[PDB]
Nucleic acid binder design. Structure first.
Ligand SMILES: O=C(O)CCC(=O)C(=O)O
Ligand SMILES: [Mn+2]
Length: 201
DNA sequence: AGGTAACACGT
DNA sequence: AACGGTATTACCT
């Protein structure tokens, strides 16, 4: 096992990938990918957007889940049924049959893009797991512990891989190392990740 | 009190 | 380039 309460389901989303990617494009046509600026004033290397009832965003004052896209000033697009179904099946396979996400953060990684080691704790109900779907180019996922200096596991995540963490491992530090350039026939030159959460009550 | 930015340079 | 400092503070509510 990846950790207590955590598992990787390799190639779980492989068969669903083409549809998922069509729906990413549909979501982004309404709420475009944007590289967000941290409260500290740095532009993130990962480009992001959201779908579902709540979207993760930065602002001057910190991080926030909000029902409105601050760039368009309209609600985030509805969560595609392909996304919701894949998430439900993955969560069930990982031992979290009751998971009901209300938020999906869509990450796009160009070569060089990274996500520094962090915890997912913007969500009030820590009982719900995180379901994380990889698409396109491969990336090295770091998965640690409750403390930043806890030893890291480094796992390659490839197209279609799904990682789920929760319970004892819900607050574990994790991240993505700078993406290697490459080619993938479905995403061409990038990696996408879908991160499903229950962000509200 | 407690929340929490850093989902972001030097060795 | 893997590891860890920084928030060891200065603000909010
Ligand atoms: O891209 C990934 O695999 C991880 C994304 C992530 O950690 C997040 O969106 O909070
Ligand atoms: Mn995360």
């Amino acid at each position: 096992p990846l950790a207590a309460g955590a598992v990787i389901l390799r190639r779980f989303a492989f068969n669903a990938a083409e549809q998922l990617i069509r729906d990413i494009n549909d979501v982004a046509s309404q709420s475009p990918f944007r590289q967000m600026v941290t409260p500290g004033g740095y532009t993130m290397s990962v480009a992001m957007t959201n779908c579902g009832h709540l979207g993760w965003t930065t602002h001057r004052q910190g991080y926030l889940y909000s029902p409105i896209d601050p760039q368009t000033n309209k609600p985030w697009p509805a969560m595609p049924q392909s996304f919701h179904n894949l998430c439900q099946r993955a969560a069930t396979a990982a031992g979290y049959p009751d998971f009901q996400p209300d938020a999906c953060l869509i990450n796009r990684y160009a070569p060089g893009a990274k996500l520094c080691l962090h915890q997912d704790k913007d969500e009030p109900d820590l009982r719900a797991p995180i379901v994380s779907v990889s698409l396109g180019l491969p990336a090295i996922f770091q998965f640690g512990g409750l403390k930043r200096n806890d030893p890291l596991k480094r796992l390659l995540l490839e197209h279609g891989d799904v990682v789920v963490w929760g319970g004892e491992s819900r607050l574990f530090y994790h991240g993505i190392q700078p993406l290697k350039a490459g080619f993938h026939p479905l995403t061409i030159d990038c990696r996408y990740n879908l991160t499903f959460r229950q962000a509200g009550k």
